[PDB]
Design a binder for this molecule. Structure first.
Ligand SMILES: NC(=O)c1ccc[n+]([C@@H]2O[C@H](COP(=O)([O-])OP(=O)(O)OC[C@H]3O[C@@H](n4cnc5c(N)ncnc54)[C@H](OP(=O)(O)O)[C@@H]3O)[C@@H](O)[C@H]2O)c1
Ligand SMILES: NC(=O)c1ccc[n+]([C@@H]2O[C@H](COP(=O)([O-])OP(=O)(O)OC[C@H]3O[C@@H](n4cnc5c(N)ncnc54)[C@H](OP(=O)(O)O)[C@@H]3O)[C@@H](O)[C@H]2O)c1
Ligand SMILES: NC(=O)c1ccc[n+]([C@@H]2O[C@H](COP(=O)([O-])OP(=O)(O)OC[C@H]3O[C@@H](n4cnc5c(N)ncnc54)[C@H](OP(=O)(O)O)[C@@H]3O)[C@@H](O)[C@H]2O)c1
Ligand SMILES: NC(=O)c1ccc[n+]([C@@H]2O[C@H](COP(=O)([O-])OP(=O)(O)OC[C@H]3O[C@@H](n4cnc5c(N)ncnc54)[C@H](OP(=O)(O)O)[C@@H]3O)[C@@H](O)[C@H]2O)c1
Ligand SMILES: CC1=CC[C@@]2(C[C@@H]1O)[C@@H](C(=O)O)CC[C@H]2C(C)C
Ligand SMILES: CC1=CC[C@@]2(C[C@@H]1O)[C@@H](C(=O)O)CC[C@H]2C(C)C
Ligand SMILES: CC1=CC[C@@]2(C[C@@H]1O)[C@@H](C(=O)O)CC[C@H]2C(C)C
Ligand SMILES: CC1=CC[C@@]2(C[C@@H]1O)[C@@H](C(=O)O)CC[C@H]2C(C)C
Lengths: 250, 248, 257, 243
């Protein structure tokens, strides 16, 4: 079972931590006395978040501002974050490029950036953080969505990026479960959450602060997948036993 | 009915070797207009015409190049004066390997295996809109479930499902009468695949055939594996519920 | 004297902010910690700008993409931007329709599009902002040109719309003095500036030194912050001097009675 | 015997110009919206020795009318020597609030219609090596309150017609363009709308004189003081400098 003391003194990265769920996660991590490095584009808002993390009781708290459209930044960020903390125990991959509910016409650039920020940068950040996490026997936490497990209209490019996370990180999970690499991988399937962006872009939305905690919890407990939706009807059918079998079979 | 492919205008990517080739042959034998592509093609074009192909042309190039991909569909459209079935089959080359460091291969996989299919589809959309046609996406078990050794690949095929399943439901809620067929294929007896992977491997001829059948029939998904125990279990009933459920 | 701190936490709009001078202005405003909302038609290039402004230290940075051919968009843009920032201090009217130096024959559609985008939308945007500007005792910054003060060939439709800005905004400036509305109106008269667009359009026909866009942009903002009536900016100091019109300031000060 | 168009010629300075033009034995086509007052002007023109005199009614809100008006007036006279653009939309003195309609309408009638009318006349004018006369205002060279929309339209004329004047200058196109900056004039419209006002009858003459003499600009005010100031030598320098 989960105890907030499991995070005390743990060295933790939170991406897309300036707004929404990622911010809540940083604050939670702080109140559990964790070393935290937050990141996002907003140089200004990030510093505001760091100050609040120290007040809430972070062992330490830094920011590095940048955009995850830049794969170079992502490599460097992990190196620099590891320097500021003296290691890394948990990498939380939460950031997304902004997406709207729209029928797809011909916007190939939106598909491309979506795939870059929402998927590729996670692989880059993963690669850079893997030495430290192998050493700490750490966790990678991937934030995904219902839209990454089931099809919904109006969100194709986004959905395509969330499906890839599952495909790529689940394949890696198995690869770590045989090469003995003792890093856990936690895919989080979230329903609608009551963040500013989500509401001002669109069902019942679950509370952001409780959501953030469930992500941290699942990651701390080293769970393979985490589900969180405002409904229990939703959450229960999102699991898929047919897959567990096929996988176990081969 | 093999008559449904009579005189229809079709593109087949990755049609130089393996399944894409067999798809061209079967399509030639039903007398369809075909434009094949890859980077051996002429040898393929010969056999196609002499099997009963209404018209068989080619355009060689790399689907690494998105500009090439956008032009190809137009040029192939010029060459046939319209389009009824776009078949997306090509993939960049993959060796079974523990993913360690290869961000290059990850990025190229998303480009060729996923991103090009989207470019091709944008280009073909006008012609397919008028012809009330069909898009056929060749995917894999690895686009439905996880396997080690193939992460980059799995991610690209997963990407296809997320994307094309999403625009499928979009077209229903726009009445755009273009069908979308995701082909979930188990191990097939193609040249390259055998020289990369123990398990029973299905025959490439019934595969190519099966794919085309499903595309012609406008089936949402096509399953095909040398194990019939699996094929029933590879379908996901849990998912179909939730999609119709949230359809509110 | 102007202090970069003057703009910190000030809520600002910049139109035409995807390229050239508008882009540079947004950047400068970001460095100074301003709340910024940018606009133009291209949402891809606008997203790039918003990212950079956040990196550079914008208090906030949004965009809203649309054409200023649409007066509905312009009237709405301000509302949405006002919402995003919780007010408005400075309105910077920078965008123009695309125009290429060509002798005028019969192109009335160009002429009408030039008055629409270059002049009319500015009026629309101003009307929309004035309520929020009144409250903050804010500023309107109107970017014009030498071709808005003197005649040049090949750019008639353009010239006419720029001249028109002068007549109109100069008139409501005097209105606001009398009515005691405390909103400043800064008209910026610029020579050739080394923006990508300008160079591509003048390159093989016009011989002159182009002033730097980065400096140009900073001048406008300073002029607007210091609530100056006119800002002049050309690479030649001869030009910047003989641009002002004293005889006109007399005539205006005469009829003030 | 010169063929001339006069727009906004039902009253005020337009009407007075029509009279002077008739009294010099010129062929004249007048226009405005009101058919009734136009009929009256056509006759008084016939009385004063007009070589010919007809009217065509219509609103210069309509660019189709303007385009076709110049065509019809040109056929009716078999050519054109002088185009006098004088008309304006009805404008009051008011602090501008949010009435974008007035602003849009002002640029349409007062500036945009003039361009259309000009474009239409150009072949006939090139043929006669004729003249465009644009009536403008103090408020088109300097800023006054209460008249924002109006001034904007007048400024626009200056910008536009001064640019094309330098255009025709290098194309060698032999059509003169005369910009007329007028102070307050004692027209009925003007009056209803505490300074001294010049006489409408002399002003009209001054406009006609300047256009006949192919002057670039004409100034006219009830004050010798203003007229001297209204000129801009800084402008002439950089205009000629950047040449
Ligand atoms: N909200 C929901 O209902 C919901 C549901 C399911 C899954 N999720 C997942 O939860 C995660 C976050 O959701 P959210 O609602 O919290 O999103 P959000 O509130 O919009 O926050 C997104 C974060 O990413 C940052 N960001 C945006 N563009 C970036 C870029 N190019 N490089 C780096 N950072 C960038 C943003 O900060 P800056 O703008 O300052 O850069 C912000 O901190 C995402 O993975 C999303 O897919 C959310
Ligand atoms: N074989 C199986 O067991 C199996 C199982 C499940 C799914 N699938 C799927 O079925 C499809 C066909 O696979 P396959 O085994 O037939 O493959 P294959 O025999 O290796 O054929 C690959 C095809 O793609 C072309 N290609 C390679 N790189 C390309 C590029 N950059 N741009 C454009 N074309 C390129 C190749 O032509 P060139 O070499 O001349 O360029 C060739 O025609 C694939 O989508 C695969 O994922 C296959
Ligand atoms: N560069 C010079 O030498 C110079 C000299 C004197 C005066 N100026 C003045 O400075 C200002 C900016 O000039 P610049 O050279 O920086 O211009 P620019 O680089 O051409 O930028 C024009 C901006 O306006 C936007 N725009 C164009 N058409 C639009 C429309 N229909 N609706 C909305 N936005 C539109 C463009 O974005 P999208 O196309 O993506 O919408 C772009 O962001 C103008 O007012 C110009 O008159 C410039
Ligand atoms: N009055 C002054 O003190 C003064 C001073 C400086 C400059 N100016 C300029 O001198 C010119 C003459 O002014 P003014 O005082 O003579 O004016 P006015 O006496 O009111 O004459 C205006 C003329 O324009 C016509 N008109 C109005 N709306 C029209 C429309 N939509 N389409 C076509 N014609 C239309 C009127 O005819 P209908 O009403 O019958 O349609 C009338 O014949 C104007 O360009 C003005 O700006 C005047
Ligand atoms: C039905 C549904 C679709 C997806 C989203 C809402 C909800 O989960 C959420 C998600 O990222 O999963 C938040 C934003 C929204 C997007 C449509 C932009
Ligand atoms: C277990 C299994 C994994 C995937 C593949 C074999 C089989 O389907 C096939 C596929 O693409 O689906 C062909 C190539 C191969 C890859 C490991 C390279
Ligand atoms: C002589 C001269 C004329 C005007 C311009 C160049 C220069 O200032 C500049 C302006 O907007 O003022 C930029 C674009 C250009 C136009 C001719 C298209
Ligand atoms: C101070 C002054 C302003 C302009 C006008 C009077 C004078 O010239 C004249 C003009 O058009 O030039 C006539 C109408 C009037 C307007 C205020 C309505």
């Amino acid at each position: 079972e989960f105890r907030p003391e499991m995070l005390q003194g743990k060295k933790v990265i939170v991406t897309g931590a300036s707004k929404g769920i990622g911010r809540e996660m940083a604050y939670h991590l702080a109140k559990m006395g964790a070393h935290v490095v937050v990141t996002a584009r907003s140089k200004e808002t990030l510093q505001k978040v760091v100050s609040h993390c120290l007040e809430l009781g972070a062992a330490s708290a830094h920011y590095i501002a940048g955009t995850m459209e830049d794969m170079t930044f992502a490599e460097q960020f992990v190196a620099q974050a590891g320097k500021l903390m003296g290691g890394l125990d948990m990498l939380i991959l939460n950031h997304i490029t902004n997406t709207s509910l729209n029928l797809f016409h011909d916007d190939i650039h939106h598909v491309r950036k979506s795939m870059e920020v929402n998927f590729l940068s996670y692989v880059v950040l993963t690669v850079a953080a893997l030495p430290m996490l192998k050493q700490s026997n750490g966790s990678i936490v991937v934030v995904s969505s219902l839209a990454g497990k089931v099809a919904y209209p109006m969100v194709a490019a986004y959905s395509a990026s969330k499906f890839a996370l599952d495909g790529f990180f689940s394949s890696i999970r198995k690869e770590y479960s045989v090469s003995r690499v003792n890093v856990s991988i936690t895919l989080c399937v979230l329903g609608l959450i009551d963040t500013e962006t989500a509401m001002k872009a669109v069902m019942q939305a679950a509370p952001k602060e409780e959501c953030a905690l469930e992500i941290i919890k699942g990651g701390a407990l080293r769970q393979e997948e985490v589900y969180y939706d405002s409904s229990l009807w939703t959450t229960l059918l999102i699991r898929n036993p047919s897959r567990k079998i096929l996988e176990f079979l081969y």
